[PDB]
Amino acid sequence: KAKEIRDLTTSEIEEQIKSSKEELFNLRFQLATGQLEETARIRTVRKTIARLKTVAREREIEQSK
RNA sequence: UUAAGUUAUUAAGGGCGCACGGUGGAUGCCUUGGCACUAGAAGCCGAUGAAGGACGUUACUAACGACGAUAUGCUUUGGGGA
């Protein structure tokens, strides 16, 4: 998942960020209830958010020059 | 049976020796770190916010490292081949 991101509009980038955060908050918020058995899934999510914001920032630069 | 004479047996415990352990950690051997130096480079960092630090970040997480709310790491460019 590196150039799935490059296929975006610079506006869809925001929405998948938000929805990924709600996905996450669902998991974090279940997590102390113990409903969750999945452990390593969260890393994938948080890393995705890192990617989306990274690329958004890079294009933020190259839309500045 | 008598008088006289002599004399050892005892080891509660101790000493000498001999053995078997226990204690505690020297010596022997080794190095996971260091001392002193040669050749060569480099000899600065910072208001475009340092050096140094606080608080946090892991699936469960107390500490060191690593990192900083994009958080136990992100993208790219090369290298490498489970």
UniProtKB/Swiss-Prot annotation:
Instruction: List the keywords (alphabetical).
Output: Ribonucleoprotein, Ribosomal protein
Q: Which GO terms describe its cellular component?
A: cytosolic large ribosomal subunit
Per the record, the domain of life is Bacteria
Ribosomal protein: present as a keyword of the record? Answer: yes
UniProt GO MF annotations: structural constituent of ribosome
Coiled-coil boundaries: none
Question: Known Gene3D superfamilies for this protein?
Answer: 1.10.287.310
Q: Which GO terms describe its biological process?
A: translation
Q: Which family does it belong to?
A: Belongs to the universal ribosomal protein uL29 family.
The record's NCBIfam families line, in alphabetical order, gives: L29
Per its record, how is this protein called by name?
Large ribosomal subunit protein uL29
Q: What species is given as this protein's source?
A: Staphylococcus aureus (strain NCTC 8325 / PS 47)
